Amino acid sequence: DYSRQNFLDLNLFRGLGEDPAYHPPVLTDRPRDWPLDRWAEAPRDLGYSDFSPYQWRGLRMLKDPDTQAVYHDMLWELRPRTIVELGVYNGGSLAWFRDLTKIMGIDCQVIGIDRDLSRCQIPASDMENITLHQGDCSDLTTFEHLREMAHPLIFIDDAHANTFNIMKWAVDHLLEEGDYFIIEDMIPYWYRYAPQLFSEYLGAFRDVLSMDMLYANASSQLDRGVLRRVA
Amino acid sequence: DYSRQNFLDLNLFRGLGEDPAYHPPVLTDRPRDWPLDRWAEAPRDLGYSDFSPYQWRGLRMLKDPDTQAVYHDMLWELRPRTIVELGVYNGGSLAWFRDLTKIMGIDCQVIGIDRDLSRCQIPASDMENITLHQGDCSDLTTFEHLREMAHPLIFIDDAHANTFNIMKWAVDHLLEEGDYFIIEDMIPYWYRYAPQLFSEYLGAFRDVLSMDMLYANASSQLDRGVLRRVAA
Amino acid sequence: NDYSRQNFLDLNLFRGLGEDPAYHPPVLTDRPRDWPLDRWAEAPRDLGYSDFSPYQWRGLRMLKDPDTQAVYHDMLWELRPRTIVELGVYNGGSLAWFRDLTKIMGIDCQVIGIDRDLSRCQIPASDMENITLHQGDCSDLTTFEHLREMAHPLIFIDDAHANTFNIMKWAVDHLLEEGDYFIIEDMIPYWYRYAPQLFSEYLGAFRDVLSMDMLYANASSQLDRGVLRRVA
Amino acid sequence: NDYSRQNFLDLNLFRGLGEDPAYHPPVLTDRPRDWPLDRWAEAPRDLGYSDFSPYQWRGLRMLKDPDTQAVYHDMLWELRPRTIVELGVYNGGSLAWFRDLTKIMGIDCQVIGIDRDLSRCQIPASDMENITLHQGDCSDLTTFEHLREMAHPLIFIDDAHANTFNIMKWAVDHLLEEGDYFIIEDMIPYWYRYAPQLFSEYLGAFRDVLSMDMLYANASSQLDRGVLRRV
Amino acid sequence: NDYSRQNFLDLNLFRGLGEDPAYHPPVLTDRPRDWPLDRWAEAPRDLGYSDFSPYQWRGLRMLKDPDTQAVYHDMLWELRPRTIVELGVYNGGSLAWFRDLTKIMGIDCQVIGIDRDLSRCQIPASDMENITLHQGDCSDLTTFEHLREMAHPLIFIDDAHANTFNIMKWAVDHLLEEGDYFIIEDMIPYWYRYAPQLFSEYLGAFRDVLSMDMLYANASSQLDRGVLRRVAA
Amino acid sequence: NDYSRQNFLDLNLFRGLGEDPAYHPPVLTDRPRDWPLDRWAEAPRDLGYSDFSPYQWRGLRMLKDPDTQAVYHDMLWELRPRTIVELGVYNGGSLAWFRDLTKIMGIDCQVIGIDRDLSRCQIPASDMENITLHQGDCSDLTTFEHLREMAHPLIFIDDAHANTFNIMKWAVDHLLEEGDYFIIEDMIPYWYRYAPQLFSEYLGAFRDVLSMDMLYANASSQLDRGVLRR
Ligand SMILES: C[S@+](CC[C@H](N)C(=O)[O-])C[C@H]1O[C@@H](n2cnc3c(N)ncnc32)[C@H](O)[C@@H]1O
Ligand SMILES: C[S@+](CC[C@H](N)C(=O)[O-])C[C@H]1O[C@@H](n2cnc3c(N)ncnc32)[C@H](O)[C@@H]1O
Ligand SMILES: C[S@@+](CC[C@H](N)C(=O)[O-])C[C@H]1O[C@@H](n2cnc3c(N)ncnc32)[C@H](O)[C@@H]1O
Ligand SMILES: C[S@@+](CC[C@H](N)C(=O)[O-])C[C@H]1O[C@@H](n2cnc3c(N)ncnc32)[C@H](O)[C@@H]1O
Ligand SMILES: C[S@@+](CC[C@H](N)C(=O)[O-])C[C@H]1O[C@@H](n2cnc3c(N)ncnc32)[C@H](O)[C@@H]1O
């Protein structure tokens, strides 16, 4: 088996999964319809190992429900005119953000940037108020090609490359008082691995960004990574 | 002062709160804008009560995030034409179910039943495809006066009163194959307090209802309480 | 279809009580009672039965768990109350226990029980020395005004959880003297969770007449932050 | 340099017991006993003093914590013992408790306590009805030989924790009848930890005479897997 | 302000490593080192510094924490390896430790560190007895082809986590004899989380050659379900 | 009936030691050593043997667990002790470890083990280099008065736990120099719990001569709040 098979690097699926396309979970060790006469003997665990088993309208979502409630609250209060997502994957959170603002009556343009848009599962007929843009975050030439968009604005780092140089770029070019810059996932790990540089780098933005303590502790993905532009 | 006062029974607010109207959390022991030069010294706890801090479009929502996820998947799968909810309170979940079905392209009437609609706060401008009904759940006539409903259907007990007689009524007079009958919150408590009677009660429905294992363990509010109608 | 051959009680009747007020010794199911000592190490480690309210006193169900009993023992040994009033009797377990404890300690104490329904009380007719029963609703302050004078010190215990703050106001003005207790069992953590603004205002109204007794207030989950006494 | 003046007692003398046999009511160290109700939400939530062995019965210390008390209540109510031998006494709170408890149940029970040292016993002489104290060492089997006229049923409790297994032999042969209990408090878990193969061998020797009562044997951490009775 | 003047490193450069491969003792910031004994009760109970990776060996940082050292000690003692390979070297603390432990145990064992970048290695040149350094990328199997043929038993440790299953395939067919270990540190729990189906199949293709050693595989959180060896069933 | 004939040892003899001073590797009972990889996810995740005191060094049982070994490694690295006294020797595992660790650090350290009973000790004579054993009860001070003069710096470790505070007094008055350590293992949490009042007084009697070293005192559950110096 091993000799007649070339192996993929499982690092490619880091925090993403094996398949960008959504598939409902399969139960492997119980029936789906458990009989009520044996109700007490039914197993109490989830029944499936699916990595991040969350979806919006048939599209995988890497934002888990607690993260979703924070963004709900944030969209409701800010009524953002632009949401930029750095890192697209399957585009599920793109479609989620456009749909949420649509239901809230907020006229919001959702912009998604990725190096690799081939994984995006959103059909063409469902792309109203959603623009894609191919390009690396490993270089800032990607971001300069932006038709100057409306405010308020939420800028979400979901690609985790060159992040502080991008935050610098965002303060110098794009962000206005009240706008958010959000770093998903990485902050607690960066403080863990490099406390001193992290403390200094974040501290270099003391006069331009603050940490929003309404939302910063409300989800584990956004944990201490919700920042906004101060006056 | 206590001599002046006359004190309300706080049990009125059990599992609810004191104001059906939503208000953003209020920070008590910290500023909203933490300085980044002191990022490491910032308090790590939530900063407010975790009781029921959720909302949908300015309306309080007593369905927490993991519950919302189960209901999204369920709505996406079943594509229900009618959702009935016992217990309306502020209307948050009614507006949410209506909204979620609408953005999915599903034609879904949402129906709310409650003995007290005076706390519902969904503006009429936002009430499309929602029908409220006043009536006590303890009285079966509340349900006998309901009109024909389209299927598939999801019937959700959130009032917690007279539940097993209501489930009996729904099986004989409403639920068709594939429909859900969900009991929110109550099942772990009833089983803890009255395990033998609960088991016997639930097992009495063994030929008509099954526990849906895809959803029954995925949220603590819905825990062991997601049921659906099986073939006759 | 057993459900159609049955009527269903509201399982809310058994909230935090259980199905049967009579005590029955717990019974093992998935193991023999006598485990052979050659297989000692393979014996299951779990309780073997439900840990919901399994406590008793001389064949009467007792809804006070051991840590609560420890608190009341200490409190009785310090205060030596002449009177113990218990709102909410259920099956009489804590009544007989309060009378028995005070008798062992050489304390001449009258125990009084107040309940809307004394039909579940299982105390033998022969074991009612220094115990008095009153049928009445806590929702009417009449129940308490008609009570005849009682000796002090005195411990008043809310275990019925209805009209609690109006009763506390009544008890401060017309019953409690310096050093007497008013104890709200179980309920205080829940009211603070569900109604923090009103709960803090209501408790604050009593700031000049009652204080939290920190020696007992944190020593049991049932009495958690619920032990108060009269000031001069 | 105060260390040079003193002779230091061996703190191992106080192992699992405390400094003083006499009961001393807990002292709140960092709070007032009366907490103002207008600042109710600010009050500390922890116990407020050491939870080591703060339990008592009628002004005497009790080294049996409440969960153990409840087990022994259930066992006394079921068995209705005419005799309760306590090996190891200390202050005598357990003696007075067992005697008081049997007495309110209408059980006519004699309570016998054995100990090498009865000077720590604090039961007043007036309050010694149906209690008998005996001064011997547990290691030496002659202590037990010197009386055995006891009515049944009978509960035998080891709190001395010395020469326990030889004592259990003498018990099965020269004392216990069908239904009588033999209880090893506290030590069983620890002896399985340090000497599993030996403990298993020693215990397994009693397979034909004694069994583990599974109704009571997991109901309290002090009694954990130490409640045995004759079959 | 200060951010305007700065150019920021990608903090992923330090993922699981730290900012400095050189060892620096922890230092206290919020208490005195010498706590007075008359106030012993009041002294804080927490560690007093970051527990990320504070471990060392003879002045060199060690990314293998104590419970993992205890497992490798047992395994060295039982197996008595003549060769220990270490994919990914970093500062060389583990290399110096493996060589020292085998030396103290009386085992004649060569230690071979492989890595794309050996500049971070802090082992003094005067203390490199029975240690060999090869510089090459792990993604490319050219790095292992030119390796001299080593004595067995052998322990092969993946601490670089790149192209890991192609290297495991190559190890089985070109290097691993019966009894030898192939240890994947850190990654297995994470790979099963993100890619449960693809991971279970890949591992399972080695069911005829490799097995999981249950004496060591649950004995440390870094080695968690990743101690394999060329042994049957 | 196997019980009627047997004469049972006191199991308290094994309190905190175990039944055998010699090292025997852990053994699997409820599973195979080689789990098949096609059932990898099915394999049990628990350790599979008793976690009591499974540790060793060179075929010798070691009652110092891994977290305690890291603390002592750091302490040796920083202080560079010329002498290490261990009260309580048992199998001699900690002693051989201490000698080995000092030697590989290039430190010239004599290790001195004291114990009432040296019969359990199992170091081969071949590996006894730089280890001096002494027989004596800790329960009486004569054991320490017969000790010869020792090189500094020095680490005095108590693992016997008898007569400890008197021995600490002796050590301050007759042995310890500035910078030297006196470490009480295992016992300090327990003595505070059972006798907080006398323990506080006793430890506080030493306030002018010893201090709790906070860099090491909270780093191990065996050394927890018992790492002292000066
Ligand atoms: C899947 S996450 C995006 C999260 C997504 N918006 C969501 O929450 O559903 C990471 C994505 O960022 C992309 N990415 C990683 N590094 C990048 C880089 N250097 N430049 C552009 N995109 C990158 C990956 O292709 C991947 O699709
Ligand atoms: C807050 S929950 C409703 C949950 C709501 N759907 C949500 O998630 O936002 C409880 C509601 O049930 C109602 N209720 C309680 N008992 C009832 C009864 N017997 N009949 C009808 N409604 C009842 C209460 O008035 C209250 O509004
Ligand atoms: C928890 S039981 C009492 C516990 C009992 N004191 C003990 O410790 O074992 C609650 C009792 O309160 C009674 N009860 C509930 N509401 C009441 C009310 N409004 N007035 C009087 N009794 C009430 C119920 O009938 C029930 O017997
Ligand atoms: C744990 S205390 C007894 C506590 C009390 N019986 C209870 O359960 O609440 C242990 C007692 O056993 C006694 N003891 C300890 N070793 C003994 C021995 N070898 N022989 C006789 N008595 C002993 C001690 O004097 C001490 O008072
Ligand atoms: C976890 S550290 C090595 C652990 C070290 N042997 C120890 O335990 O003390 C990871 C090392 O692997 C190296 N590395 C990362 N990716 C690599 C690759 N693709 N090829 C070769 N080495 C790589 C890094 O440069 C780094 O030095």
Ligand SMILES: [Mg+2]
């Ligand atoms: Mg992300």
Ligand SMILES: [Mg+2]
């Ligand atoms: Mg509810």
Ligand SMILES: [Mg+2]
């Ligand atoms: Mg209660």
Ligand SMILES: [Mg+2]
């Ligand atoms: Mg004891």
Ligand SMILES: [Mg+2]
């Ligand atoms: Mg690693």
Ligand SMILES: [Mg+2]
């Ligand atoms: Mg030790």
